Every structure is written in structure tokens, then in C-alpha cells.
Amino acid sequence: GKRQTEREKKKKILAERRKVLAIDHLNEDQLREKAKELWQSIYNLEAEKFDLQEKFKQQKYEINVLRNRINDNQ
Amino acid sequence: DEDETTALVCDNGSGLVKAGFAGDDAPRAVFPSIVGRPRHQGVMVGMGQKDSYVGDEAQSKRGILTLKYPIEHGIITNWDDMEKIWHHTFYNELRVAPEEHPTLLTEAPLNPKANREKMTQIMFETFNVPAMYVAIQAVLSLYASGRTTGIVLDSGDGVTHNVPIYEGYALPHAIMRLDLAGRDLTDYLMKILTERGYSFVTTAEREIVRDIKEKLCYVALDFENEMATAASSSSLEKSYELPDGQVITIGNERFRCPETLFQPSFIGMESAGIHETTYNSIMKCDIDIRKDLYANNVMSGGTTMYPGIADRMQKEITALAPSTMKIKIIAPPERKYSVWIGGSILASLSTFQQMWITKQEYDEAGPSIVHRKCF
Amino acid sequence: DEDETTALVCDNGSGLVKAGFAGDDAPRAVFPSIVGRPRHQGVMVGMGQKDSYVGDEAQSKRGILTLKYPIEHGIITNWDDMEKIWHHTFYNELRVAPEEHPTLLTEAPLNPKANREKMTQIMFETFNVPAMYVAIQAVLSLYASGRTTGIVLDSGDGVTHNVPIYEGYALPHAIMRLDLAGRDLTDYLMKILTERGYSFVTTAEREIVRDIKEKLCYVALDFENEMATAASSSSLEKSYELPDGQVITIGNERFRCPETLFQPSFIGMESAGIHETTYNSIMKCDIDIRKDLYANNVMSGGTTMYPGIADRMQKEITALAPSTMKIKIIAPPERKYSVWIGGSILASLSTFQQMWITKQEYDEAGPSIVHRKCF
Amino acid sequence: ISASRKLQLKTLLLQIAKQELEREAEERRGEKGRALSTRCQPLELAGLGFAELQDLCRQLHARVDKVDEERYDIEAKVTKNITEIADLTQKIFDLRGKFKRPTLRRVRISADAMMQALLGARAKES
Amino acid sequence: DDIYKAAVEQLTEEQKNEFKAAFDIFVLGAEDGCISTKELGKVMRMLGQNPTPEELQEMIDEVDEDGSGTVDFDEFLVMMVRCMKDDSKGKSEEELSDLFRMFDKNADGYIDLDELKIMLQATGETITEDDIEELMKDGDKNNDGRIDYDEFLEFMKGVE
Numbered sequence A: 001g002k003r004q005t006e007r008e009k010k011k012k013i014l015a016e017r018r019k020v021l022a023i024d025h026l027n028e029d030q031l032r033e034k035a036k037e038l039w040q041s042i043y044n045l046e047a048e049k050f051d052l053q054e055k056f057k058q059q060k061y062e063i064n065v066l067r068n069r070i071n072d073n074q
Numbered sequence B, C: 001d002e003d004e005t006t007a008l009v010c011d012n013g014s015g016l017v018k019a020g021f022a023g024d025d026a027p028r029a030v031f032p033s034i035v036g037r038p039r040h041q042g043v044m045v046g047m048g049q050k051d052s053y054v055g056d057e058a059q060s061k062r063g064i065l066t067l068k069y070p071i072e073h074g075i076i077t078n079w080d081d082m083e084k085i086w087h088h089t090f091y092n093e094l095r096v097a098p099e100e101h102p103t104l105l106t107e108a109p110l111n112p113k114a115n116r117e118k119m120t121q122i123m124f125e126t127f128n129v130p131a132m133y134v135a136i137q138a139v140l141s142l143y144a145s146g147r148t149t150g151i152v153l154d155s156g157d158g159v160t161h162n163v164p165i166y167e168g169y170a171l172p173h174a175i176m177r178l179d180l181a182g183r184d185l186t187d188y189l190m191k192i193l194t195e196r197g198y199s200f201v202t203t204a205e206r207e208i209v210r211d212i213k214e215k216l217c218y219v220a221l222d223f224e225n226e227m228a229t230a231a232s233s234s235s236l237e238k239s240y241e242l243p244d245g246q247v248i249t250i251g252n253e254r255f256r257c258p259e260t261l262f263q264p265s266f267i268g269m270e271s272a273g274i275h276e277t278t279y280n281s282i283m284k285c286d287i288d289i290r291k292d293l294y295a296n297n298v299m300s301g302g303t304t305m306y307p308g309i310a311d312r313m314q315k316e317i318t319a320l321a322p323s324t325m326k327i328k329i330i331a332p333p334e335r336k337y338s339v340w341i342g343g344s345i346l347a348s349l350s351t352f353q354q355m356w357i358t359k360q361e362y363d364e365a366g367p368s369i370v371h372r373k374c375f
Numbered sequence D: 001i002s003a004s005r006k007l008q009l010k011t012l013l014l015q016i017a018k019q020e021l022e023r024e025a026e027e028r029r030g031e032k033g034r035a036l037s038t039r040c041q042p043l044e045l046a047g048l049g050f051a052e053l054q055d056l057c058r059q060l061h062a063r064v065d066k067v068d069e070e071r072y073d074i075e076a077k078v079t080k081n082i083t084e085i086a087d088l089t090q091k092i093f094d095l096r097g098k099f100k101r102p103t104l105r106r107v108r109i110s111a112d113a114m115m116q117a118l119l120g121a122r123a124k125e126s
Numbered sequence E: 001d002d003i004y005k006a007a008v009e010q011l012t013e014e015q016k017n018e019f020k021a022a023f024d025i026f027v028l029g030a031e032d033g034c035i036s037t038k039e040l041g042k043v044m045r046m047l048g049q050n051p052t053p054e055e056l057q058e059m060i061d062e063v064d065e066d067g068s069g070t071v072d073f074d075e076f077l078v079m080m081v082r083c084m085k086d087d088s089k090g091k092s093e094e095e096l097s098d099l100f101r102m103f104d105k106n107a108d109g110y111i112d113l114d115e116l117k118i119m120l121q122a123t124g125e126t127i128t129e130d131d132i133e134e135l136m137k138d139g140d141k142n143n144d145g146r147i148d149y150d151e152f153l154e155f156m157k158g159v160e
């Protein structure tokens, strides 16, 4: 049963980062700068993702390399 | 390694996992169903921090790792061991991800709904698999046998299933499962060897004596007469050489170990022997097809690798049933892998490629609806 | 003198203190574990007022100083001698203060809690040390051996430890210590030499005969046969020249001195010989790994520098155990320092630099909690 | 040939290796910049109304959540890869250990002290 | 021997003259004209430290280039320059993986002889065929035509 909760926590992890946004107390000009901060968040996110991707690639090579070692000292 | 988009046939039978790609005639990755867990805590530095051994890695070290059986009688006890054995088979032997080919798994007859929903959920949510399918072992074994009629007797490690199929037709009402198999035989041999004088109480020795049984233990053609002639033993008792070197001497016990199958009273259970239960199952079937079930009975399971089962079955059925008709018992060679073989020949059909269950419909329907769709 | 911030490896083994910096292959400061105290009171003027000699300063003068052993059987008798030997090693040989680098000390298996708490307290409160760590000798010896499997036999001066380690796994339940070693052998040789005719009853002569034993005494390949052939001696008896000049003649006694290890009945103790105790320990282990323990047995301790121990062990184990398997005994060269060598290679790892115990946590926790943290 | 020439070749290998690593790092930075410019494009707030800015912010929040979901999937993959790499590396260490523990010899007495003790005043260059 | 001979050639002429003088001093009155276990131990005593016999053997085995079991002048320089540890401070495991990757440019798990040769060509120094063969042997242990990661790790001893 804890594994089902683990998948639920995976979805709950995504739920934690998102929070309610309020557009009623803001005026016309402020909303624009606030939109920009949301945009920078987007930017930031992809950057880390990109990093991970590149690392993933690197890590895969590692795996390959590692496999060869067990195929040379067996 | 694989250039054909075909399902991976992974028979997760109790006692031995047999995994391989579809189209092959035998499983390439064959390893026992055991999980070794570090018992103590070491102050040592440099060893693998891996907290969960599996397969041959656990078989190679049974003195340090406490051994746990991932399957008992059929009901799945621990799901972590399930995730461990599949993740291991995927990313340590086959060297292929499940995100590129289907997977035709084989489950035992009359299993819990929790087991099926759990494995399906681990195979859909956690691992990204394009399609899953649960199949009963008896049908695939009858496929590999190359027939459509007979009663399949599948004796695994902790469960024994009798499944009658006549004219390629299943009988879900007559399938009766009984938890008498290799583990209860290992326990009986262990307690009788403890009565002989060599006493042990650890699982590693239990696996060792299990292997000794697989290698030496056979079925008797006449229990009481062999008992009488073994009272004064000469060639009836054999001296086995333990892999460690200790000289063990085992005589009649061999052909009295599987006899517990024919006499469950030894383990104090009111259940009937495998032969008598099969006979009762035959009465539960209709009379018209009973002769065909007598003439086409098939066997499956690793436990059937003992020498002398066919003759014992023939004498017992002849003593129980009339001796006017013809009752031929057929056991195909390498029957143990036959089930898996069936899987292979079942995954190559285009129609079977049309009977898979994709992720999206399962996600909307949910696991319970998937249970209804299969049966 | 030292430009690297690395722990000082100080093996305080019974009989010989071996101190040196980490990274080296051999201890630079090697001196016996003895404390010489002025026996009489002199009216002389000008000599050193020092009231407590140690090490080579005491070895150079054994006629004036009454000799006391700072360690007996393993239990620390006097703590003043402990403070003396560390203060001496710090401010007379190494020429370095303990306030700049850690210190990896090595203690014997199965030692009292009072000993550990006392040394740790002297190393934290009195001396300002940034971090301490207690380590068992057997693990470091197995490290220096370059393996992870086998039973280490460490025979120091007053204690003998048998420690089985298979696949790196320590077995704290099977470690059995027995106080039979070089001191009881020196006592046996002394009483049998007193039986020969040369009688002495002072410690300086005891150390001299200990050195004579270290140089000449060896182990016999067949005790009774050597006794018979030595009855009529020719080349079996040797004439040794004492460092003072007195001509000593020693014959069979040599290869009968270490024999007391194999026959503790000579000293009237019901304890079993080292070989029989090791064999019993092997039965206490599991059968699965017993063959590996037979094939990877390792030795440690200065007492193992005698010639003929490997062959004697092989014949005795072959006579006790079956002669069907293979029982190879491996003794690495310069095994005595190997332990210390291990310390060196253990102090260079960054992870080990993360497993030290700093002052503040010890002060709040107290010594007893520190005992729990280590094990 | 001599061994000194091989050491010179090896050290030259190391420096040309470091320069290559720096070049690869710069190329990775450039590729990251280009990928960022392609994926996350700037905004266009000129001419948007009150409700239009609200809708744009809601859409940006949805895109934020979608990117975090993708990143979380990739990070789970990276963690599985880290686990597998650690397991395989430790298995390889256990395999390759055997008898390959090294050390630097300690009887190699330091030349400075040795040179002083052997020569006295003659030792000036060494 | 690599770092040892490098340090030897790095010595000056005046230093090598002092080394020859010290050699003549050590073999002063010897019978083999070289420094054997006996003469080396005699020198060690003359200094103060005492050397183990097996240690003396292992040391003479770590300085000879001929096979005599004794230390001559060509080996005197090595025995008198080995003090500084040039092959210490091993590169981090991540740096070692980077080294293997950039030597394995085509992404295969093996440093074929072509990669090693193009690397030697790229370094700029005049690469001698003997140097290529010696490095190829030093790396490729089993001599299959390529340096795997384990053989590459073996290539890092005596290198810094």
C-alpha cells in the first residue's frame, strides 16, 4: 500500500510547487512586471532540465564504459 | 541486442524466474526466486552499498544474507521483492528497457485480485510499458505440448494446479489449487533427516537439501515393498558427497520424500493426495470427455523432473479407475520450460499483437475494469 | 617534519609499540612495551631526576630499573605507564604535537570498556587532540593482506585472537580471545631451562631469553619423532653465544617451547591449543563459508615470526579436518607490520576523514555514548 | 628512447586534455544558451489589457507546471542512473581489487636530508 | 622508472658529478663495482636507519634498468632522485572519466590506437614510433588493439 502512496506522493510533489495566484488586487502595470517574474521562472526551470539532460547523456556513457570493465575483467 | 519489436516473455514461476525474448526456445536468464538481505551492519568501507541482493548474486552468498521467499503458496507477500526482481531482470541481464517492447507475463491459476492489480500497477505507473497482458500458465503449457485436450498438472514450488482443458476449452470452475509442492517436500525431508541425526535449522542448508533432492530424490514404484527391501539395504542406500565435502548417507528417505504428495496425512492435513485430487476432478468433469482426459493428461512444473512419476501415476490411476479402457500418460521432454516456450510462440502472432492492453485505456478504466476485460 | 595533515598511526601492540605517520610502509619508532622504574635511591648529584624511563632508554638499562609490563593479557594494569608511553612517543621521537593531526589507534579485540573509556579520556581531556578513533587490529590486518575473506590469527605477546571475516563481514560473536602467547612461552622456556641447570629469576634475563627465543626457537614438524632423534643429539643441539659471552647450549628445548601452544596442558589449563580452538571456531561458523575460511586463513602478530608455523598448521588442520578439499594457508611477508601498514592506507581515505570523532560531540555525549557510536 | 620522453608526452597529453575539456565546457555553455533562446522565448506585454495580462499569467503558470513535470521526470531518470552507476562502479571495484593495492616506498629517504648528511658543504645545487 | 628517469635527466651536471663521487664512495673497496644489498645496507648503517632485506631487494628491483640485482651509476641517479613523489595526487574519478571520454572521442568504450596516435599528433611534440609503441603497450594490456577503461586506469600509474 505504501507504493501506491509513493505514486500519489509523486503527483503530490508536483502539487506542492504550484500555488494559488491572485490577479484581483493587482493593477494594469504591476501585472506586467509580475508576468516577467513568472517568465524568468520558466527560463530557470528549463536550464536545470537542460543540465540534467546533458548529465543524463554523460551518465549513459559512464554506464557503457562501466559495462566494458565487467566485460574485460570477468 | 534485440532488433525485433516483440514482447519479453518473463515467466515468474514460484522458485525459478525464467526470462527471455519471444521467439527463443529456452529462457536465457534462469535464476531462483529468492531475495537476500544484509543481516548485520558492517563498519567496513568500500563494499557495495546495495541493500537488496537478488538472483545469482544472492545464491553466491547465502551465509551472510537472510533469505526471504518473494512468493508463498501463490500469494505475493512482499512487493519490494517484486520490484527488485523485475528491475534486476531489466537492467542487469537482458540489457533492454521495457519502454520499447511489450511484456507477456505468466501468472498462476486462481490468484488473488490484489496480486494482479498490484503487478499491473507497477508495470504501468512506475515503469513506462506500452502494453501488458496476464496469461494463465496451463494454456501456454498446453500450447507447447502441441495439443488441445488433456488435464495439465502444474506442480511449482509452493502450489500445485490441476487444470482440465478438453477441445481447447478452459474450465474455470474445476481448477482447484492445493499448496503442496517442493517446499513442503523440502520441509518433510528436512524433518526426517533431523530424525536421521543430521540436524540443521537455517535456510541455506534448506536450499542445499532442496538441490540434493532435485538431483537424487525419485518416486517409488511400490512404497511398502521398497520399505521392506530397504530394511536390509545394500544398493538401495546411497552415499552423497556434499558440495562442502561432508559425507552424507541417504537411503530410503529419497523415495519417501515425494510420497508425502500421495499421503498428505504426513503433514497432518485433511487434503487428498495429488492423484486422488486429480481423480476427483475427473469425476467433477463430464463422463463423455473423461476418457479423453484420461488419454491426454499433461504435466508441467519443475517438480516433475523427478524420475518415476509417470509410472507411479499410471499404477495409481489404474488402481483407482477401471482397467478396461486405455489410460496413456504423456510427458513432453523439457516440460518445465515448455510453458515459457509457449509464451514465445504466443507472442509472435499478429492477432495476439492486437489483444494487448495499452496504457491510456487502463488509466481511464482503472485496474478493476482491466480485470473484467481479461475475464 | 610533516607537511601533510594526516593521522598518526600508533599501534600500541602488546610487547612492541610501533608508531609512525600515515602513508608510510613501516613504523619508524619501534620500541618494546616496558617501563623501567628506579629501584634504589641514589645520593649522587647531576644525573637526570627523571623518575620514569620508557622504551629504548629502559632497554639500555635493565639492571638498575625494575621492569613492569604496561599491559597484561590485554587488560591495562597501570595508566601512568600509558600516559608515559604516549607522552614519550609524542615529545621524544616523532617531534610533533597531537594538536595538529588526528590519531588512529589500534586496540585488541574484546577489550574491557574501562580500557577504552580511559584511553579516550586521556586522549581528549588531558591532551588536546582534534579527533580520535579506535580500530580493531584484525580488520586492518585483513586490509594489509589485500583480501576480504579468511580467519585472522593475531598472536601478540600476552593474548591471542582468532577473528573470522568472510566477504568482509565481521563476526563479533565468534571472536574468542585466549591469553596464551609469548609471555607464557617465555615462562615455559625459563622453567625448562631452570630444569636444564641454568637458573635465573630476574626480568632482565627473562627479556634476554625472550630475544634468544625470537632469534632461535622454531616450531617442530613432528614433536615425538624429533624427541626420539634428539635423544642422541648431534646437529639437533646448538650452542648459542650470549651477548655477555657465557656459552649457553640449547638442544631440543627450542622446538618444545612453542609446542606449549599446541598442548596447554603443560601450563595446567583446560583451554585447548590454538589450532584446536581455531578448528572449533570454524565449526561455530556456518558450513557454507567454512571451505573459504580454510582457503583464506591469515596470520598476524610478532609471535608468527618463528620458522615452521605454516607447515605445522597445515599438518594439524589436515589431521583434524578432512583431506578431500584444498586447505591452503597464506602468510603475507612482514605480516607483523602489516597491521600498522593497514592503518596507514586507512588514514588516507577522505571518507575515513569523515568518520572521526571530534572533541565537542564527545564532551556533550560522554565516553559511554561514544562507545555506542563506534559499536 | 627514454622514459623521460614518455613522461613529457604524458604531461603534454594532460594539458591538451585540460584545454579540450575547457573547449567542451564552452561548447556546452553555448549549446545551453542557444537551447534556452529557442525554447523559452521572451514575452510581448506591449498592448495587453487587464484581463489579457491575467490570462497570459495563467498560461505562464500552466507552462511553469508543465516544465516542472518534465524536469521531475528527467530528475527521476537521473537518480535511477546515479543509483545504477554507483552499483556498477562498486561491483567493478570488487572485481578489480584482488591484488592491486599500491604504496610509495618509505625507505626512499628524502634527498635534502640525505644530501646534507652525505656531503656537508659540498651539497649546494641538489 | 618513468618519473625516476625524468628526474634523473632533470639533474644538473654538477649534481651528477656529486652523484658519481658518492657512488665511488659507496663502492669504495667493493667487489662487484656496484651497490648490492650488502653495500646498500652498509650505507644505510653508516647513515643510521636499518633496512629490511626483502625491502632492500624490492628497492633494488625498483631502480634497476639492467637486471644485475645491484645499483650502478645509471641506477644511482634514480636511487638518489626518487625522493620526490611525482605520481602522487591522483586526479578525481570524474576527471579520470573525462580523460577516458575525450580519449574515446567516437563514443565506443575503447581507446583504439588511432585515437592515441591522433592525440600524440595533436600534442605537437615530435612523436617517435618507439614512443607510440611503448605507450600503446603500457595502455593496452591484453594487446587487443585498444585501451579499455581498466587498461586506461592502469595507464595512470607513474603519470601526473
Ligand SMILES: Nc1ncnc2c1ncn2[C@@H]1O[C@H](COP(=O)(O)OP(=O)(O)O)[C@@H](O)[C@H]1O
Residues within 6 Å of the ligand: B011, B013, B014, B015, B016, B154, B155, B156, B157, B158, B181, B182, B183, B210, B213, B214, B215, B300, B301, B302, B303, B304, B305, B306, B335, B336, B337, B339
Ligand atoms: N531440475 C530440477 N529437478 C528437480 N526439481 C526441480 C528442477 N527444477 C525445479 N524443480 C522444482 O520445481 C519447483 C519450481 O518449479 P517452477 O520453476 O515453478 O516450475 P514452472 O516454471 O514450470 O512453473 C521447485 O520446488 C523445485 O524443487
Ligand SMILES: Nc1ncnc2c1ncn2[C@@H]1O[C@H](COP(=O)(O)OP(=O)(O)O)[C@@H](O)[C@H]1O
Residues within 6 Å of the ligand: C011, C013, C014, C015, C016, C154, C155, C156, C157, C158, C181, C182, C183, C210, C213, C214, C215, C300, C301, C302, C303, C304, C305, C306, C335, C336, C337, C339
Ligand atoms: N622478530 C620477531 N621474532 C620472533 N618473535 C617476535 C618478533 N617480534 C615480536 N615477536 C613476538 O611477538 C610478541 C609481540 O607481538 P606484537 O608486537 O603484539 O604483534 P602485533 O604488533 O602484530 O600485534 C612478543 O611475544 C614477541 O616475543
Ligand SMILES: [Ca+2]
Residues within 6 Å of the ligand: E034, E064, E065, E066, E067, E068, E069, E070, E071, E072, E075
Ligand atoms: Ca643494476
Ligand SMILES: [Ca+2]
Residues within 6 Å of the ligand: E103, E104, E105, E106, E107, E108, E109, E110, E111, E112, E115
Ligand atoms: Ca574510441
Ligand SMILES: [Ca+2]
Residues within 6 Å of the ligand: E139, E140, E141, E142, E143, E144, E145, E146, E147, E148, E151
Ligand atoms: Ca586492450
Ligand SMILES: [Mg+2]
Residues within 6 Å of the ligand: B013, B154, B155, B156, B157, B300, B301, B302
Ligand atoms: Mg510449475
Ligand SMILES: [Mg+2]
Residues within 6 Å of the ligand: C013, C154, C155, C156, C157, C300, C301, C302
Ligand atoms: Mg599481534
